[PDB]
């Protein structure tokens, strides 16, 4: 299927409930964000990103 | 002093007019209603830079 509404023509979206602004900075001790999911092949993936402070 | 005050009030009104009328095609800039706008300067999504006009 090549219609624009096909499931393969997109994905999933997750929007944060807490919005930030210009003067917000990443605080030390609360900088790591980990995504736990399943790849397309089926093997689990765990990607940890340590966002830089400031 | 009254004459100087009158001229100062004229310049004050000019300052307020400059703050309230300057725009980029109709988008007010210096009246405080710009806030923070993010400019996308990358070939991929999520590569924007915030500009704040006070």
Curated annotation (Swiss-Prot), chain B:
It comes from the Bacteria. Residues 1-21 form a coiled coil. It is found in: Secreted; Bacterial flagellum. Flagellin is the subunit protein which polymerizes to form the filaments of bacterial flagella. FlaD is not essential for flagellar synthesis and motility. V.cholerae is able to differentially regulate the flagellins within the flagellum maybe to produce flagella which are particularly suited for motility within a given environment. Heteromer of multiple flagellin subunits including FlaA, FlaB, FlaC, FlaD and FlaE. Belongs to the bacterial flagellin family. This is Flagellin D. The chain holds residues 109 to 162 of 377 of the full protein.
């Amino acid at each position: 299927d090549m219609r624009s509404d096909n499931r393969m023509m997109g994905g999933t979206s997750y929007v944060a409930a807490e919005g930030k602004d210009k003067d917000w900075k990443v605080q030390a001790g609360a900088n790591d964000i980990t995504f736990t999911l399943k790849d397309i092949d089926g093997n689990d993936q765990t990607i940890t990103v340590n966002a830089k402070e400031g | 002093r009254v004459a100087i005050q009158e001229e100062i009030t004229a310049l004050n009104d000019e300052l307020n007019r400059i703050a309230e009328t300057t725009s980029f095609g109709g988008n007010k800039l210096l009246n405080g209603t710009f806030s923070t706008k993010s400019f996308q300067i990358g070939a991929d999504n999520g590569e924007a830079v915030m500009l704040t006009l006070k």
